Every structure is written in structure tokens, then in C-alpha cells.
PDB file of all heavy atoms in Angstrom:
ATOM      1  N   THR I 150      -0.858 -38.671  -4.672  1.00  0.00           N
ATOM      2  CA  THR I 150      -0.480 -39.340  -5.916  1.00  0.00           C
ATOM      3  C   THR I 150       0.191 -38.332  -6.835  1.00  0.00           C
ATOM      4  O   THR I 150      -0.427 -37.801  -7.763  1.00  0.00           O
ATOM      5  CB  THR I 150      -1.702 -39.966  -6.587  1.00  0.00           C
ATOM      6  OG1 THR I 150      -2.671 -38.950  -6.870  1.00  0.00           O
ATOM      7  CG2 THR I 150      -2.324 -41.018  -5.686  1.00  0.00           C
ATOM      8  N   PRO I 151       1.470 -38.039  -6.600  1.00  0.00           N
ATOM      9  CA  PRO I 151       2.177 -37.100  -7.479  1.00  0.00           C
ATOM     10  C   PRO I 151       2.424 -37.720  -8.846  1.00  0.00           C
ATOM     11  O   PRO I 151       2.938 -38.834  -8.955  1.00  0.00           O
ATOM     12  CB  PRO I 151       3.484 -36.826  -6.729  1.00  0.00           C
ATOM     13  CG  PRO I 151       3.669 -37.992  -5.837  1.00  0.00           C
ATOM     14  CD  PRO I 151       2.312 -38.501  -5.486  1.00  0.00           C
ATOM     15  N   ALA I 152       2.063 -36.982  -9.894  1.00  0.00           N
ATOM     16  CA  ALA I 152       2.067 -37.517 -11.247  1.00  0.00           C
ATOM     17  C   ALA I 152       3.438 -37.487 -11.907  1.00  0.00           C
ATOM     18  O   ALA I 152       3.612 -38.116 -12.954  1.00  0.00           O
ATOM     19  CB  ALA I 152       1.071 -36.745 -12.113  1.00  0.00           C
ATOM     20  N   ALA I 153       4.409 -36.776 -11.335  1.00  0.00           N
ATOM     21  CA  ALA I 153       5.742 -36.759 -11.924  1.00  0.00           C
ATOM     22  C   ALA I 153       6.363 -38.150 -11.940  1.00  0.00           C
ATOM     23  O   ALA I 153       7.215 -38.439 -12.787  1.00  0.00           O
ATOM     24  CB  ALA I 153       6.638 -35.786 -11.161  1.00  0.00           C
ATOM     25  N   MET I 154       5.950 -39.021 -11.020  1.00  0.00           N
ATOM     26  CA  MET I 154       6.493 -40.373 -10.991  1.00  0.00           C
ATOM     27  C   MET I 154       6.126 -41.147 -12.249  1.00  0.00           C
ATOM     28  O   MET I 154       6.915 -41.974 -12.717  1.00  0.00           O
ATOM     29  CB  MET I 154       5.991 -41.111  -9.751  1.00  0.00           C
ATOM     30  CG  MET I 154       7.072 -41.867  -8.995  1.00  0.00           C
ATOM     31  SD  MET I 154       8.396 -40.800  -8.395  1.00  0.00           S
ATOM     32  CE  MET I 154       7.644 -40.136  -6.915  1.00  0.00           C
ATOM     33  N   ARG I 155       4.938 -40.909 -12.797  1.00  0.00           N
ATOM     34  CA  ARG I 155       4.486 -41.569 -14.011  1.00  0.00           C
ATOM     35  C   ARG I 155       4.567 -40.674 -15.238  1.00  0.00           C
ATOM     36  O   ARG I 155       4.001 -41.024 -16.279  1.00  0.00           O
ATOM     37  CB  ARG I 155       3.047 -42.061 -13.834  1.00  0.00           C
ATOM     38  CG  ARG I 155       2.822 -42.915 -12.606  1.00  0.00           C
ATOM     39  CD  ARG I 155       3.523 -44.245 -12.730  1.00  0.00           C
ATOM     40  NE  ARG I 155       3.322 -45.067 -11.545  1.00  0.00           N
ATOM     41  CZ  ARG I 155       3.595 -46.361 -11.478  1.00  0.00           C
ATOM     42  NH1 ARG I 155       4.058 -47.026 -12.521  1.00  0.00           N
ATOM     43  NH2 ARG I 155       3.390 -47.007 -10.335  1.00  0.00           N
ATOM     44  N   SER I 156       5.254 -39.536 -15.150  1.00  0.00           N
ATOM     45  CA  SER I 156       5.313 -38.565 -16.241  1.00  0.00           C
ATOM     46  C   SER I 156       3.908 -38.185 -16.700  1.00  0.00           C
ATOM     47  O   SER I 156       3.592 -38.200 -17.890  1.00  0.00           O
ATOM     48  CB  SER I 156       6.143 -39.102 -17.407  1.00  0.00           C
ATOM     49  OG  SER I 156       6.488 -38.062 -18.303  1.00  0.00           O
ATOM     50  N   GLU I 157       3.059 -37.835 -15.734  1.00  0.00           N
ATOM     51  CA  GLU I 157       1.659 -37.535 -16.004  1.00  0.00           C
ATOM     52  C   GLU I 157       1.244 -36.176 -15.449  1.00  0.00           C
ATOM     53  O   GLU I 157       0.063 -35.969 -15.159  1.00  0.00           O
ATOM     54  CB  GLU I 157       0.760 -38.635 -15.437  1.00  0.00           C
ATOM     55  CG  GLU I 157       0.655 -39.853 -16.328  1.00  0.00           C
ATOM     56  CD  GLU I 157       0.040 -41.040 -15.624  1.00  0.00           C
ATOM     57  OE1 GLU I 157       0.155 -41.126 -14.384  1.00  0.00           O
ATOM     58  OE2 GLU I 157      -0.560 -41.893 -16.311  1.00  0.00           O
ATOM     59  N   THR I 158       2.181 -35.246 -15.298  1.00  0.00           N
ATOM     60  CA  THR I 158       1.817 -33.882 -14.951  1.00  0.00           C
ATOM     61  C   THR I 158       1.286 -33.156 -16.184  1.00  0.00           C
ATOM     62  O   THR I 158       1.178 -33.719 -17.276  1.00  0.00           O
ATOM     63  CB  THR I 158       3.016 -33.133 -14.368  1.00  0.00           C
ATOM     64  OG1 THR I 158       4.070 -33.082 -15.335  1.00  0.00           O
ATOM     65  CG2 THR I 158       3.516 -33.819 -13.114  1.00  0.00           C
ATOM     66  N   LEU I 159       0.943 -31.885 -16.001  1.00  0.00           N
ATOM     67  CA  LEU I 159       0.543 -31.062 -17.134  1.00  0.00           C
ATOM     68  C   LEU I 159       1.719 -30.879 -18.082  1.00  0.00           C
ATOM     69  O   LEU I 159       2.884 -30.910 -17.674  1.00  0.00           O
ATOM     70  CB  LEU I 159       0.036 -29.699 -16.662  1.00  0.00           C
ATOM     71  CG  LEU I 159      -1.233 -29.688 -15.817  1.00  0.00           C
ATOM     72  CD1 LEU I 159      -1.486 -28.299 -15.279  1.00  0.00           C
ATOM     73  CD2 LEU I 159      -2.426 -30.173 -16.620  1.00  0.00           C
ATOM     74  N   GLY I 160       1.409 -30.691 -19.359  1.00  0.00           N
ATOM     75  CA  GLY I 160       2.447 -30.486 -20.345  1.00  0.00           C
ATOM     76  C   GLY I 160       3.373 -29.342 -19.982  1.00  0.00           C
ATOM     77  O   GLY I 160       3.143 -28.584 -19.042  1.00  0.00           O
ATOM     78  N   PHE I 161       4.448 -29.221 -20.757  1.00  0.00           N
ATOM     79  CA  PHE I 161       5.480 -28.225 -20.506  1.00  0.00           C
ATOM     80  C   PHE I 161       5.471 -27.078 -21.505  1.00  0.00           C
ATOM     81  O   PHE I 161       6.312 -26.183 -21.397  1.00  0.00           O
ATOM     82  CB  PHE I 161       6.862 -28.885 -20.515  1.00  0.00           C
ATOM     83  CG  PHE I 161       7.071 -29.894 -19.421  1.00  0.00           C
ATOM     84  CD1 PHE I 161       8.115 -30.789 -19.495  1.00  0.00           C
ATOM     85  CD2 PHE I 161       6.237 -29.945 -18.319  1.00  0.00           C
ATOM     86  CE1 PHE I 161       8.318 -31.716 -18.503  1.00  0.00           C
ATOM     87  CE2 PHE I 161       6.440 -30.873 -17.327  1.00  0.00           C
ATOM     88  CZ  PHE I 161       7.480 -31.757 -17.419  1.00  0.00           C
ATOM     89  N   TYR I 162       4.559 -27.078 -22.474  1.00  0.00           N
ATOM     90  CA  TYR I 162       4.519 -26.034 -23.488  1.00  0.00           C
ATOM     91  C   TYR I 162       3.294 -25.155 -23.287  1.00  0.00           C
ATOM     92  O   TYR I 162       2.167 -25.672 -23.286  1.00  0.00           O
ATOM     93  CB  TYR I 162       4.508 -26.647 -24.882  1.00  0.00           C
ATOM     94  CG  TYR I 162       5.599 -27.662 -25.096  1.00  0.00           C
ATOM     95  CD1 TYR I 162       5.342 -29.016 -24.980  1.00  0.00           C
ATOM     96  CD2 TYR I 162       6.886 -27.266 -25.406  1.00  0.00           C
ATOM     97  CE1 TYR I 162       6.335 -29.943 -25.173  1.00  0.00           C
ATOM     98  CE2 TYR I 162       7.886 -28.188 -25.599  1.00  0.00           C
ATOM     99  CZ  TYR I 162       7.604 -29.524 -25.483  1.00  0.00           C
ATOM    100  OH  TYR I 162       8.597 -30.455 -25.675  1.00  0.00           O
ATOM    101  N   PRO I 163       3.452 -23.841 -23.115  1.00  0.00           N
ATOM    102  CA  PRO I 163       2.267 -22.981 -22.975  1.00  0.00           C
ATOM    103  C   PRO I 163       1.344 -23.000 -24.177  1.00  0.00           C
ATOM    104  O   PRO I 163       0.150 -22.721 -24.028  1.00  0.00           O
ATOM    105  CB  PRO I 163       2.873 -21.589 -22.765  1.00  0.00           C
ATOM    106  CG  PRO I 163       4.221 -21.838 -22.231  1.00  0.00           C
ATOM    107  CD  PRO I 163       4.696 -23.105 -22.849  1.00  0.00           C
ATOM    108  N   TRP I 164       1.856 -23.309 -25.365  1.00  0.00           N
ATOM    109  CA  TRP I 164       1.067 -23.234 -26.585  1.00  0.00           C
ATOM    110  C   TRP I 164       0.551 -24.589 -27.049  1.00  0.00           C
ATOM    111  O   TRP I 164       0.078 -24.696 -28.182  1.00  0.00           O
ATOM    112  CB  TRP I 164       1.886 -22.585 -27.706  1.00  0.00           C
ATOM    113  CG  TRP I 164       3.191 -23.253 -27.978  1.00  0.00           C
ATOM    114  CD1 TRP I 164       3.426 -24.249 -28.872  1.00  0.00           C
ATOM    115  CD2 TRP I 164       4.448 -22.962 -27.361  1.00  0.00           C
ATOM    116  NE1 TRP I 164       4.746 -24.605 -28.846  1.00  0.00           N
ATOM    117  CE2 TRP I 164       5.397 -23.826 -27.927  1.00  0.00           C
ATOM    118  CE3 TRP I 164       4.862 -22.053 -26.386  1.00  0.00           C
ATOM    119  CZ2 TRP I 164       6.731 -23.815 -27.552  1.00  0.00           C
ATOM    120  CZ3 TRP I 164       6.188 -22.044 -26.017  1.00  0.00           C
ATOM    121  CH2 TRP I 164       7.107 -22.919 -26.596  1.00  0.00           C
ATOM    122  N   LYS I 165       0.629 -25.619 -26.211  1.00  0.00           N
ATOM    123  CA  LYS I 165       0.105 -26.926 -26.558  1.00  0.00           C
ATOM    124  C   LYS I 165      -0.942 -27.351 -25.541  1.00  0.00           C
ATOM    125  O   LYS I 165      -0.658 -27.341 -24.337  1.00  0.00           O
ATOM    126  CB  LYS I 165       1.231 -27.962 -26.612  1.00  0.00           C
ATOM    127  CG  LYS I 165       0.864 -29.212 -27.385  1.00  0.00           C
ATOM    128  CD  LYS I 165       1.777 -30.377 -27.048  1.00  0.00           C
ATOM    129  CE  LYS I 165       1.741 -31.438 -28.138  1.00  0.00           C
ATOM    130  NZ  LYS I 165       2.737 -32.524 -27.916  1.00  0.00           N
ATOM    131  N   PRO I 166      -2.151 -27.720 -25.966  1.00  0.00           N
ATOM    132  CA  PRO I 166      -3.148 -28.200 -25.007  1.00  0.00           C
ATOM    133  C   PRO I 166      -2.673 -29.457 -24.294  1.00  0.00           C
ATOM    134  O   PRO I 166      -1.884 -30.245 -24.817  1.00  0.00           O
ATOM    135  CB  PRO I 166      -4.375 -28.483 -25.878  1.00  0.00           C
ATOM    136  CG  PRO I 166      -4.199 -27.625 -27.061  1.00  0.00           C
ATOM    137  CD  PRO I 166      -2.729 -27.560 -27.311  1.00  0.00           C
ATOM    138  N   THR I 167      -3.175 -29.638 -23.075  1.00  0.00           N
ATOM    139  CA  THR I 167      -2.756 -30.739 -22.225  1.00  0.00           C
ATOM    140  C   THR I 167      -3.986 -31.434 -21.662  1.00  0.00           C
ATOM    141  O   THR I 167      -5.117 -30.983 -21.844  1.00  0.00           O
ATOM    142  CB  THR I 167      -1.847 -30.249 -21.090  1.00  0.00           C
ATOM    143  OG1 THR I 167      -1.365 -31.369 -20.337  1.00  0.00           O
ATOM    144  CG2 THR I 167      -2.596 -29.303 -20.170  1.00  0.00           C
ATOM    145  N   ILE I 168      -3.748 -32.550 -20.980  1.00  0.00           N
ATOM    146  CA  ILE I 168      -4.823 -33.383 -20.448  1.00  0.00           C
ATOM    147  C   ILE I 168      -4.551 -33.679 -18.979  1.00  0.00           C
ATOM    148  O   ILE I 168      -3.389 -33.660 -18.553  1.00  0.00           O
ATOM    149  CB  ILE I 168      -4.959 -34.689 -21.243  1.00  0.00           C
ATOM    150  CG1 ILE I 168      -3.643 -35.474 -21.202  1.00  0.00           C
ATOM    151  CG2 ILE I 168      -5.377 -34.394 -22.669  1.00  0.00           C
ATOM    152  CD1 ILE I 168      -3.559 -36.595 -22.208  1.00  0.00           C
ATOM    153  N   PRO I 169      -5.573 -33.948 -18.173  1.00  0.00           N
ATOM    154  CA  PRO I 169      -5.330 -34.413 -16.809  1.00  0.00           C
ATOM    155  C   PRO I 169      -5.278 -35.929 -16.744  1.00  0.00           C
ATOM    156  O   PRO I 169      -5.976 -36.635 -17.477  1.00  0.00           O
ATOM    157  CB  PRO I 169      -6.534 -33.863 -16.039  1.00  0.00           C
ATOM    158  CG  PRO I 169      -7.632 -33.857 -17.044  1.00  0.00           C
ATOM    159  CD  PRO I 169      -7.006 -33.705 -18.413  1.00  0.00           C
ATOM    160  N   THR I 170      -4.439 -36.424 -15.857  1.00  0.00           N
ATOM    161  CA  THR I 170      -4.264 -37.865 -15.741  1.00  0.00           C
ATOM    162  C   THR I 170      -5.466 -38.482 -15.035  1.00  0.00           C
ATOM    163  O   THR I 170      -5.921 -37.946 -14.020  1.00  0.00           O
ATOM    164  CB  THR I 170      -2.982 -38.194 -14.979  1.00  0.00           C
ATOM    165  OG1 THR I 170      -2.668 -39.583 -15.143  1.00  0.00           O
ATOM    166  CG2 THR I 170      -3.129 -37.880 -13.500  1.00  0.00           C
ATOM    167  N   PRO I 171      -6.012 -39.589 -15.535  1.00  0.00           N
ATOM    168  CA  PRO I 171      -7.047 -40.297 -14.771  1.00  0.00           C
ATOM    169  C   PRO I 171      -6.506 -40.704 -13.412  1.00  0.00           C
ATOM    170  O   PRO I 171      -5.352 -41.116 -13.283  1.00  0.00           O
ATOM    171  CB  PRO I 171      -7.368 -41.508 -15.651  1.00  0.00           C
ATOM    172  CG  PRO I 171      -6.964 -41.101 -17.015  1.00  0.00           C
ATOM    173  CD  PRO I 171      -5.784 -40.209 -16.850  1.00  0.00           C
ATOM    174  N   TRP I 172      -7.348 -40.593 -12.393  1.00  0.00           N
ATOM    175  CA  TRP I 172      -6.879 -40.747 -11.027  1.00  0.00           C
ATOM    176  C   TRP I 172      -7.149 -42.147 -10.496  1.00  0.00           C
ATOM    177  O   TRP I 172      -8.190 -42.749 -10.769  1.00  0.00           O
ATOM    178  CB  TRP I 172      -7.533 -39.718 -10.110  1.00  0.00           C
ATOM    179  CG  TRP I 172      -6.894 -39.672  -8.768  1.00  0.00           C
ATOM    180  CD1 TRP I 172      -5.584 -39.439  -8.498  1.00  0.00           C
ATOM    181  CD2 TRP I 172      -7.535 -39.868  -7.505  1.00  0.00           C
ATOM    182  NE1 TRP I 172      -5.364 -39.478  -7.149  1.00  0.00           N
ATOM    183  CE2 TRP I 172      -6.548 -39.740  -6.514  1.00  0.00           C
ATOM    184  CE3 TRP I 172      -8.849 -40.140  -7.116  1.00  0.00           C
ATOM    185  CZ2 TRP I 172      -6.829 -39.872  -5.162  1.00  0.00           C
ATOM    186  CZ3 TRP I 172      -9.125 -40.270  -5.775  1.00  0.00           C
ATOM    187  CH2 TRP I 172      -8.121 -40.137  -4.812  1.00  0.00           C
ATOM    188  N   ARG I 173      -6.189 -42.655  -9.734  1.00  0.00           N
ATOM    189  CA  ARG I 173      -6.288 -43.950  -9.086  1.00  0.00           C
ATOM    190  C   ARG I 173      -5.366 -43.933  -7.879  1.00  0.00           C
ATOM    191  O   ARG I 173      -4.445 -43.118  -7.794  1.00  0.00           O
ATOM    192  CB  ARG I 173      -5.923 -45.088 -10.044  1.00  0.00           C
ATOM    193  CG  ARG I 173      -4.517 -44.999 -10.616  1.00  0.00           C
ATOM    194  CD  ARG I 173      -4.441 -44.135 -11.854  1.00  0.00           C
ATOM    195  NE  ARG I 173      -3.102 -44.153 -12.426  1.00  0.00           N
ATOM    196  CZ  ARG I 173      -2.662 -43.311 -13.350  1.00  0.00           C
ATOM    197  NH1 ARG I 173      -3.427 -42.345 -13.828  1.00  0.00           N
ATOM    198  NH2 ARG I 173      -1.421 -43.440 -13.804  1.00  0.00           N
ATOM    199  N   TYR I 174      -5.622 -44.835  -6.937  1.00  0.00           N
ATOM    200  CA  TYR I 174      -4.780 -44.960  -5.760  1.00  0.00           C
ATOM    201  C   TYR I 174      -4.686 -46.427  -5.373  1.00  0.00           C
ATOM    202  O   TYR I 174      -5.491 -47.257  -5.798  1.00  0.00           O
ATOM    203  CB  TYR I 174      -5.298 -44.108  -4.589  1.00  0.00           C
ATOM    204  CG  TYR I 174      -6.736 -44.354  -4.203  1.00  0.00           C
ATOM    205  CD1 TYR I 174      -7.082 -45.400  -3.367  1.00  0.00           C
ATOM    206  CD2 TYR I 174      -7.749 -43.530  -4.668  1.00  0.00           C
ATOM    207  CE1 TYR I 174      -8.390 -45.623  -3.011  1.00  0.00           C
ATOM    208  CE2 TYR I 174      -9.058 -43.746  -4.317  1.00  0.00           C
ATOM    209  CZ  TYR I 174      -9.373 -44.793  -3.489  1.00  0.00           C
ATOM    210  OH  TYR I 174     -10.680 -45.012  -3.137  1.00  0.00           O
ATOM    211  N   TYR I 175      -3.675 -46.738  -4.569  1.00  0.00           N
ATOM    212  CA  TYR I 175      -3.381 -48.123  -4.239  1.00  0.00           C
ATOM    213  C   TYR I 175      -4.365 -48.663  -3.212  1.00  0.00           C
ATOM    214  O   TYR I 175      -4.593 -48.052  -2.165  1.00  0.00           O
ATOM    215  CB  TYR I 175      -1.959 -48.253  -3.705  1.00  0.00           C
ATOM    216  CG  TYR I 175      -0.889 -48.252  -4.767  1.00  0.00           C
ATOM    217  CD1 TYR I 175       0.003 -47.201  -4.873  1.00  0.00           C
ATOM    218  CD2 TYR I 175      -0.761 -49.307  -5.651  1.00  0.00           C
ATOM    219  CE1 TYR I 175       0.980 -47.197  -5.831  1.00  0.00           C
ATOM    220  CE2 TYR I 175       0.216 -49.310  -6.610  1.00  0.00           C
ATOM    221  CZ  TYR I 175       1.085 -48.252  -6.696  1.00  0.00           C
ATOM    222  OH  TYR I 175       2.064 -48.250  -7.654  1.00  0.00           O
ATOM    223  N   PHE I 176      -4.932 -49.818  -3.518  1.00  0.00           N
ATOM    224  CA  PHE I 176      -5.736 -50.590  -2.590  1.00  0.00           C
ATOM    225  C   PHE I 176      -4.886 -51.714  -2.013  1.00  0.00           C
ATOM    226  O   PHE I 176      -4.085 -52.334  -2.711  1.00  0.00           O
ATOM    227  CB  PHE I 176      -6.957 -51.155  -3.312  1.00  0.00           C
ATOM    228  CG  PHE I 176      -8.015 -51.672  -2.400  1.00  0.00           C
ATOM    229  CD1 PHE I 176      -8.819 -50.804  -1.693  1.00  0.00           C
ATOM    230  CD2 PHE I 176      -8.215 -53.028  -2.255  1.00  0.00           C
ATOM    231  CE1 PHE I 176      -9.793 -51.278  -0.863  1.00  0.00           C
ATOM    232  CE2 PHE I 176      -9.189 -53.504  -1.424  1.00  0.00           C
ATOM    233  CZ  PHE I 176      -9.978 -52.632  -0.727  1.00  0.00           C
ATOM    234  N   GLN I 177      -5.073 -51.982  -0.724  1.00  0.00           N
ATOM    235  CA  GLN I 177      -4.189 -52.910  -0.035  1.00  0.00           C
ATOM    236  C   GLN I 177      -4.277 -54.305  -0.634  1.00  0.00           C
ATOM    237  O   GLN I 177      -5.341 -54.751  -1.070  1.00  0.00           O
ATOM    238  CB  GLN I 177      -4.517 -52.969   1.455  1.00  0.00           C
ATOM    239  CG  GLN I 177      -3.350 -53.466   2.298  1.00  0.00           C
ATOM    240  CD  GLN I 177      -3.412 -54.951   2.595  1.00  0.00           C
ATOM    241  OE1 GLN I 177      -4.239 -55.674   2.044  1.00  0.00           O
ATOM    242  NE2 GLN I 177      -2.511 -55.420   3.447  1.00  0.00           N
ATOM    243  N   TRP I 178      -3.138 -54.988  -0.662  1.00  0.00           N
ATOM    244  CA  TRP I 178      -3.079 -56.376  -1.080  1.00  0.00           C
ATOM    245  C   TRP I 178      -1.889 -57.031  -0.402  1.00  0.00           C
ATOM    246  O   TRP I 178      -0.936 -56.363   0.002  1.00  0.00           O
ATOM    247  CB  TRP I 178      -2.963 -56.513  -2.601  1.00  0.00           C
ATOM    248  CG  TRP I 178      -1.595 -56.223  -3.133  1.00  0.00           C
ATOM    249  CD1 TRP I 178      -0.654 -57.130  -3.499  1.00  0.00           C
ATOM    250  CD2 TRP I 178      -1.018 -54.937  -3.357  1.00  0.00           C
ATOM    251  NE1 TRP I 178       0.475 -56.493  -3.938  1.00  0.00           N
ATOM    252  CE2 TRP I 178       0.278 -55.143  -3.854  1.00  0.00           C
ATOM    253  CE3 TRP I 178      -1.472 -53.630  -3.184  1.00  0.00           C
ATOM    254  CZ2 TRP I 178       1.120 -54.091  -4.193  1.00  0.00           C
ATOM    255  CZ3 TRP I 178      -0.635 -52.591  -3.510  1.00  0.00           C
ATOM    256  CH2 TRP I 178       0.646 -52.824  -4.010  1.00  0.00           C
ATOM    257  N   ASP I 179      -1.958 -58.349  -0.273  1.00  0.00           N
ATOM    258  CA  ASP I 179      -0.859 -59.146   0.250  1.00  0.00           C
ATOM    259  C   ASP I 179      -0.288 -59.984  -0.884  1.00  0.00           C
ATOM    260  O   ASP I 179      -1.044 -60.580  -1.658  1.00  0.00           O
ATOM    261  CB  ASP I 179      -1.329 -60.033   1.402  1.00  0.00           C
ATOM    262  CG  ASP I 179      -1.623 -59.245   2.659  1.00  0.00           C
ATOM    263  OD1 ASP I 179      -1.320 -58.036   2.689  1.00  0.00           O
ATOM    264  OD2 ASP I 179      -2.171 -59.831   3.615  1.00  0.00           O
ATOM    265  N   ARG I 180       1.037 -60.023  -0.988  1.00  0.00           N
ATOM    266  CA  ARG I 180       1.693 -60.703  -2.093  1.00  0.00           C
ATOM    267  C   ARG I 180       3.013 -61.293  -1.619  1.00  0.00           C
ATOM    268  O   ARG I 180       3.726 -60.688  -0.815  1.00  0.00           O
ATOM    269  CB  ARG I 180       1.929 -59.743  -3.263  1.00  0.00           C
ATOM    270  CG  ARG I 180       2.218 -60.409  -4.594  1.00  0.00           C
ATOM    271  CD  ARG I 180       3.698 -60.609  -4.821  1.00  0.00           C
ATOM    272  NE  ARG I 180       4.026 -60.658  -6.239  1.00  0.00           N
ATOM    273  CZ  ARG I 180       3.752 -61.678  -7.039  1.00  0.00           C
ATOM    274  NH1 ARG I 180       3.118 -62.751  -6.599  1.00  0.00           N
ATOM    275  NH2 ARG I 180       4.121 -61.619  -8.314  1.00  0.00           N
ATOM    276  N   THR I 181       3.329 -62.479  -2.131  1.00  0.00           N
ATOM    277  CA  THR I 181       4.588 -63.155  -1.854  1.00  0.00           C
ATOM    278  C   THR I 181       5.209 -63.615  -3.164  1.00  0.00           C
ATOM    279  O   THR I 181       4.513 -64.133  -4.041  1.00  0.00           O
ATOM    280  CB  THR I 181       4.387 -64.355  -0.920  1.00  0.00           C
ATOM    281  OG1 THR I 181       4.325 -63.901   0.437  1.00  0.00           O
ATOM    282  CG2 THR I 181       5.527 -65.351  -1.061  1.00  0.00           C
ATOM    283  N   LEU I 182       6.521 -63.433  -3.287  1.00  0.00           N
ATOM    284  CA  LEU I 182       7.256 -63.827  -4.489  1.00  0.00           C
ATOM    285  C   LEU I 182       8.655 -64.258  -4.063  1.00  0.00           C
ATOM    286  O   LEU I 182       9.511 -63.414  -3.786  1.00  0.00           O
ATOM    287  CB  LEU I 182       7.310 -62.685  -5.494  1.00  0.00           C
ATOM    288  CG  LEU I 182       8.090 -62.946  -6.781  1.00  0.00           C
ATOM    289  CD1 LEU I 182       7.541 -64.149  -7.521  1.00  0.00           C
ATOM    290  CD2 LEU I 182       8.069 -61.718  -7.665  1.00  0.00           C
ATOM    291  N   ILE I 183       8.885 -65.565  -4.015  1.00  0.00           N
ATOM    292  CA  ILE I 183      10.190 -66.106  -3.643  1.00  0.00           C
ATOM    293  C   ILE I 183      11.113 -65.985  -4.850  1.00  0.00           C
ATOM    294  O   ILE I 183      10.794 -66.520  -5.920  1.00  0.00           O
ATOM    295  CB  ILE I 183      10.078 -67.561  -3.165  1.00  0.00           C
ATOM    296  CG1 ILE I 183       9.161 -67.652  -1.944  1.00  0.00           C
ATOM    297  CG2 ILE I 183      11.451 -68.125  -2.849  1.00  0.00           C
ATOM    298  CD1 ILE I 183       9.656 -66.901  -0.726  1.00  0.00           C
ATOM    299  N   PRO I 184      12.250 -65.305  -4.737  1.00  0.00           N
ATOM    300  CA  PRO I 184      13.096 -65.081  -5.912  1.00  0.00           C
ATOM    301  C   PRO I 184      13.795 -66.355  -6.359  1.00  0.00           C
ATOM    302  O   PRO I 184      13.834 -67.369  -5.660  1.00  0.00           O
ATOM    303  CB  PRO I 184      14.099 -64.031  -5.432  1.00  0.00           C
ATOM    304  CG  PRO I 184      14.153 -64.206  -3.974  1.00  0.00           C
ATOM    305  CD  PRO I 184      12.794 -64.635  -3.544  1.00  0.00           C
ATOM    306  N   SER I 185      14.364 -66.282  -7.557  1.00  0.00           N
ATOM    307  CA  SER I 185      14.988 -67.436  -8.184  1.00  0.00           C
ATOM    308  C   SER I 185      15.944 -66.951  -9.263  1.00  0.00           C
ATOM    309  O   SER I 185      16.140 -65.750  -9.456  1.00  0.00           O
ATOM    310  CB  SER I 185      13.938 -68.377  -8.773  1.00  0.00           C
ATOM    311  OG  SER I 185      13.061 -67.674  -9.633  1.00  0.00           O
ATOM    312  N   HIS I 186      16.542 -67.910  -9.960  1.00  0.00           N
ATOM    313  CA  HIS I 186      17.468 -67.633 -11.042  1.00  0.00           C
ATOM    314  C   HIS I 186      17.231 -68.621 -12.173  1.00  0.00           C
ATOM    315  O   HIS I 186      16.597 -69.662 -11.993  1.00  0.00           O
ATOM    316  CB  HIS I 186      18.921 -67.718 -10.569  1.00  0.00           C
ATOM    317  CG  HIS I 186      19.316 -69.070 -10.065  1.00  0.00           C
ATOM    318  ND1 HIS I 186      19.657 -70.107 -10.905  1.00  0.00           N
ATOM    319  CD2 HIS I 186      19.427 -69.554  -8.806  1.00  0.00           C
ATOM    320  CE1 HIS I 186      19.960 -71.172 -10.186  1.00  0.00           C
ATOM    321  NE2 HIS I 186      19.828 -70.863  -8.909  1.00  0.00           N
ATOM    322  N   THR I 187      17.737 -68.275 -13.350  1.00  0.00           N
ATOM    323  CA  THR I 187      17.701 -69.206 -14.466  1.00  0.00           C
ATOM    324  C   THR I 187      18.445 -70.472 -14.077  1.00  0.00           C
ATOM    325  O   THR I 187      19.668 -70.459 -13.905  1.00  0.00           O
ATOM    326  CB  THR I 187      18.330 -68.574 -15.706  1.00  0.00           C
ATOM    327  OG1 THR I 187      17.698 -67.318 -15.979  1.00  0.00           O
ATOM    328  CG2 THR I 187      18.174 -69.486 -16.913  1.00  0.00           C
TER     329      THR I 187
END
């Protein structure tokens, strides 16, 4: 789960405190969505 995809890595400033991203991962699901238009 690389955090750069969600902009959730460690901060970029050495002089600013940072936080770690809460962790989660994908659980399998089945989904169907037939597309359409206005």
C-alpha cells in the first residue's frame, strides 16, 4: 500500500512534524455497473 498514491507519505519539511497514515487494504468484492448517459 504505497502512500504516494493518496498523498499520505511523510511530510517534506525536516522542521515540521508529520503523521503516519492509518493503514487499510482492499478486501475482495464483486461489483457491476452498466454505463449510461444523460
